Amino acid sequence: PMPLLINLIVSLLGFVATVTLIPAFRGHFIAARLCGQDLNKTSRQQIPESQGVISGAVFLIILFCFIPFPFLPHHEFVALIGALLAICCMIFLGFADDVLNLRWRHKLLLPTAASLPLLMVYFTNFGNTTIVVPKPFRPILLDLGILYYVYMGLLAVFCTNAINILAGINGLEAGQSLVISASIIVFNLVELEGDCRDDHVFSLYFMIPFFFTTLGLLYHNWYPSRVFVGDTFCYFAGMTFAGVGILGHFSKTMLLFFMPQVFNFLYSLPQLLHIIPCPRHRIPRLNIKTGKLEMSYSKFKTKSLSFLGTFILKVAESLQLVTVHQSETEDGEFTECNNMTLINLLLKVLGPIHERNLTLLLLLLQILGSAITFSIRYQLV
Amino acid sequence: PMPLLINLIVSLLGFVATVTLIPAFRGHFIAARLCGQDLNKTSRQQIPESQGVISGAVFLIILFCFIPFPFLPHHEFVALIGALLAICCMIFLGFADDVLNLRWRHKLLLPTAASLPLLMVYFTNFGNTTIVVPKPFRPILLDLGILYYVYMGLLAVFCTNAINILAGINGLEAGQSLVISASIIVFNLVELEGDCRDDHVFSLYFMIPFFFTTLGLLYHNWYPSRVFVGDTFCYFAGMTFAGVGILGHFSKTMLLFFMPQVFNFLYSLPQLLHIIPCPRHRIPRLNIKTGKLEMSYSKFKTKSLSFLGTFILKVAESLQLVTVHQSETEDGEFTECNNMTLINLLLKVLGPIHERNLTLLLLLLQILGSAITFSIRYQLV
Ligand SMILES: CC(=O)N[C@H]1[C@@H](O[C@@H]2O[C@H](C[C@@H](O)[C@H]3O[C@@H](n4ccc(=O)[nH]c4=O)[C@H](O)[C@@H]3O)[C@H](O)[C@H](O)[C@H]2NC(=O)/C=C/CCCCCCCCCC(C)C)O[C@H](CO)[C@@H](O)[C@@H]1O
Ligand SMILES: CC(=O)N[C@H]1[C@@H](O[C@@H]2O[C@H](C[C@@H](O)[C@H]3O[C@@H](n4ccc(=O)[nH]c4=O)[C@H](O)[C@@H]3O)[C@H](O)[C@H](O)[C@H]2NC(=O)/C=C/CCCCCCCCCC(C)C)O[C@H](CO)[C@@H](O)[C@@H]1O
């Protein structure tokens, strides 16, 4: 555990670096107009956005410096440089999506291009394209070949976006990733005792610095948010997870650590596909008098709604998932449905919750999921 | 020459891609405020900057797609992925310098960090740290060891900045790189016939797409500039050259292709070090009535000037390099010295030249240098 010792020493130095540099560059981002308002707060001040660029940068300098230590053989060297190319490309693309505000078309396609070094490394290092069925005898009728490479391409696209759309409250994005990376770190140390070690000693090389830099980011992103992580971070986070999952051969376990993100993605799916009107910001509404966050709604004319739309809505209404409020004015009759997100579903079930408590609750919900996965995979039921 | 055939097919597709995408993203950059005015033109309209991000992006997608072709052994695979990590990191850092407008401190240090994958690849692939003396028996008294790795670190820092400071006129930055990359391509094809082939088949993999994408950029950057290349491109260009020079083992020949850039850097050195006052923009002044570009000056109080400053200035004045105009008002006595740049020295020698002609003249001057290098290295005097 000597390269891991070096990896931890540089990760702690990376944490110090991230914590120190984020306030040092504040000026540059406010000047560059890379900032947004805390939409769930009465304060109209603009907080610097895209701070994941600073932690992501620190992350790259750390690992570039780390490269000779696990060697001072190329099977793990190709995977190291390759994974760093896919991550660097993603922090780059993420920052450009933050700066240029790209279309949903790019939010999908470009992460597939950035994930190519991982696919190519897997191709040249002859990766096992044959998968093992985790579900019972029902879907079991397999060398997925190109469809396995399609899966690896669509993994980075899911991971980054799933984090990115489960956001809008102080320390949720950096915080959820902090639970996920820690869950992978714990898992790596357990599996570091036997069988697959080369996969977990490798995954730890990327996860220990991702954790300590994200911690340095959360130092300024936690409530009250002084800085915002931005798309740059979601892109970086998603790809680092998708990368270690792919090359470490544990994307299945990793996707189980991603349970709140998966629920949020699917619960959002009718809005994301625009079958039910999707507003630009689906973050909860602040009740200025209460101080706590109340559910956000998407009101629209019921006549304009499609046959599939009113079907999905009425099935979700009955399943006690959405809070539908129908009204009628001089303009006509409307339908004010609940904004389909895990944050608003938590406010639907537990009522209005304060911002600091709501994030903390979601992080605990993330902690519970990791316990469920760790219980499933290690017999603790 | 089959992977080279594939490399050229994708490079032509890359040229088409760059030419098509640059006007498609114009909206995003104007919105993102990533734009500047053509300071040598009367028109106050803002032209989108950082377009090197689009060509640099196209470049990365091409080469990521190219990766399996020269293989479908890891000695050239590590160098390929490694060089792409150093380049991707540089397009990323360059874009952040364009967006955040970093200090001169970062313009130097950060390119050294981005060049680490090249150094590390050279370290692991056991690169020849021992250099051969090109100059005569005078400096010949050598395993430079760490000082050779210092050289490789400072190569990317020189290459990017040297291009970046020899700019400010339509198609100079993209155009000079277009002569340099073509000079390396020609040289690679000559040396592809014998001896070192693995170094030139490798250098061509990066130079053919750099050329065809930069061509696609020059399509919109040539006079009258519709778009601006930005720091993103200078960073990308510099590193791609520094990369192929380092890994291909021909940084010496490459630095001889960089002759106008070297003269411009050293001629600028008293201003860059602030021994003689350095104005923010050292680009020539447009004579609205003439239409042609006239020399730019740096006027200052002669009393405020240091003992070394007035010494360098008077040595350059006598050497017939700077045009010094001394004046005296009620405020006191001033000194209006010529802005120390190869562009203003060309206007000092040839008089006022029109912008389109001036760039074209500098590109021809770049062409002459490549002929001088090719004559030196292949006996054509
Ligand atoms: C539709 C959806 O879910 N869109 C949500 C998503 O939109 C993204 O806002 C950010 C800007 C926010 O960070 C802003 O939120 C504010 N903020 C931030 C942090 C905080 O603590 N407090 C706060 O007030 C701040 O003012 C900041 O500027 C970007 O514009 C980004 O591009 C947006 N990103 C997107 O719009 C992403 C869309 C992806 C569409 C889905 C496509 C499918 C992807 C998966 C495919 C997988 C398959 C292959 C399996 O996130 C929003 C919330 O952070 C939510 O309010 C918003 O509802
Ligand atoms: C001091 C110096 O030479 N500084 C020149 C340098 O400044 C850089 O302007 C750009 C903004 C220009 O692209 C603007 O110029 C306009 N433009 C552009 C293209 C065109 O065709 N027409 C036009 O009008 C447009 O409005 C655009 O916004 C950036 O701000 C960049 O950060 C600047 N970059 C720097 O300031 C870079 C400084 C590096 C300092 C030297 C440090 C030493 C480096 C070498 C060390 C090597 C050793 C290790 C051996 O370049 C300037 C000109 O493009 C010139 O006017 C200016 O004089």
- A296 C-beta closer than 6 A to ligand 1: no
Q: How far apart are CA B319 and CA B312, in angstroms?
A: 10
CA-angle at A278, arms to A275 and A283, nearest 5°: 145
Cβ within 8 Å, pair A77-B101: no
CA dihedral A281, A284, A286, A291 (to 10 degrees): -150
Half-sphere exposure of A282 (CA within 13 A, CB side): 25
Question: Do the strands A325-328 and A293-294 form a parallel or antiparallel pair, or are they unpaired?
Answer: unpaired
Determine how many CB atoms are found less than 10 A away from the CB of residue A379: 6
- Could you tell me which chain A residue has the CA closest to the CA of B66? A120
The residue assigned the tokens 């005078």 is B138
Task: Please give the distance of CA B42 from its chain centroid, rounded to a whole number.
Answer: 27
Q: For residue B64, give the nearest of A65, A68, A113 by CB distance.
A: A113
The two structure tokens encoding residue B226: 């519709």
Tell me which amino acid residue A198 is: D
According to DSSP, residue B130 is labeled: B
**Helix A259-272 with A146-164: angle, nearest 10 deg:** 90
Residue B167 dihedral angles phi and psi, to the nearest 5°: -150, -175
Q: How far apart are CA B377 and CA A334, in angstroms?
A: 80
Q: How far apart are CA A234 and CA A167, in angstroms?
A: 10
Segments making up each domain of chain A, as ranges: 1-257+354-381, 258-353
Q: How far apart are CA B357 and CA B354, in angstroms?
A: 5
Closest among B176, B154, B202 to B257, alpha carbons compared: B176
Q: How far apart are CA B41 and CA B288, in angstroms?
A: 8
- Report which bound ligand comes closest to the CA of B280: 2
- Report which bound ligand comes closest to the CA of B151: 2
H and E: helices and strands count for chain B: 14, 7
- B111 CA distance to ligand 2 centroid (A)? 16
Q: How far apart are CA B84 and CA B101, in angstroms?
A: 24
The two structure tokens encoding residue B291: 């239409």
User: What is the three-state SS of chain A?
Assistant: CHHHHHHHHHHHHHHHHHHHHHHHHHHHHHHCCCEEECCCCCCCCEEECCCHHHHHHHHHHHHHHHCCCCCCCCHHHHHHHHHHHHHHHHHHHHHHHHHHCCCHHHHHHHHHHHCHHHHHHHHHCCCCCECCCCCCCCCCCCECCHHHHHHHHHHHHHHHHHHHCCCCCCCHHHHHHHHHHHHHHHHHHHCCCCCCCHHHHHHHHHHHHHHHHHHHHHHHHCCCCCCCCHHHHHHHHHHHHHHHHHHHCCHHHHHHHCHHHHHHHHHHHHHHCCCCCCCCCCCCEECCCCCCEECCEEEEECCCCCHHHHHHHHHHHHCCCCCCEEEECCCCEEEEEECCCHHHHHHHHHCCECHHHHHHHHHHHHHHHHHHHHHHHHCCC
Chain B residues near residue A31 by CB distance under 8 angstroms: 100-101
The two structure tokens encoding residue A229: 């992580």
Per the entry, the structure determination technique was: X-ray
Q: Is B105 annotated as a binding residue?
A: no
Residue A355 dihedral angles phi and psi, to the nearest 5°: -50, -50
According to DSSP, residue B143 is labeled: B
- Report which bound ligand comes closest to the CA of B356: 2
Closest among A367, A59, A18 to A227, alpha carbons compared: A18
Q: For residue A92, give the nearest of B61, B91, B124 by CB distance.
A: B91
CA torsion sign, B216 to B221 to B225 to B229?
Answer: positive
Closest among B301, A353, A19, B182 to B310, alpha carbons compared: B301
Give the strand order in the sheet containing A297-301. Answer: A297-301, A333-338, A325-328
Tell me which amino acid residue A150 is: V
The two structure tokens encoding residue A379: 């017999």
Cβ within 8 Å, pair B100-A60: no
The two structure tokens encoding residue B122: 């050279």
DSSP state letters, B72-85: --THHHHHHHHHHH
Cβ within 8 Å, pair A32-B101: yes
Determine how many CB atoms are found less than 10 A away from the CB of residue B365: 16
Tell me which amino acid residue A101 is: N
Q: How far apart are CA B38 and CA A93, in angstroms?
A: 28
Query: Is residue A109 less than 8 Å (CB to CB) from chain B?
Result: no
Query: Is residue B35 less than 8 Å (CB to CB) from chain A?
Result: no
Closest among B187, B184, B191 to B206, alpha carbons compared: B184
Residues B117, A117: contact at Cβ < 8 Å?
no
Start-to-end Cα distance in chain A: 32
- B162 CA distance to ligand 2 centroid (A)? 10
Query: Is residue A53 less than 8 Å (CB to CB) from chain B?
Result: yes
| A282 phi-psi bin (left φ>0, alpha ψ -120 to 50, beta other) | alpha
The C-alpha R_g of chain B, in whole angstroms, comes to 22
Q: How far apart are CA A310 and CA A321, in angstroms?
A: 14
Query: Is residue B10 less than 8 Å (CB to CB) from chain A?
Result: no
This PDB structure is determined at a resolution in Å of 3.4
Query: Which residues does a 6 A CB cutoff place in the pocket of ligand 2?
Result: B 36-40, 49, 104, 107-108, 154, 157-158, 161, 164-165, 167-170, 225, 228, 231, 268, 272, 278, 281-283
Closest among B252, B240, B339 to B296, alpha carbons compared: B339
Tell me which amino acid residue A51 is: Q
The two structure tokens encoding residue A86: 């896919």
Tell me which amino acid residue B304 is: S
Tell me which amino acid residue A303 is: K
Tell me which amino acid residue A12 is: L
The two structure tokens encoding residue B321: 């390099």
The residue assigned the tokens 């980075």 is A156
Closest among B360, B337, B365, B342 to B278, alpha carbons compared: B337
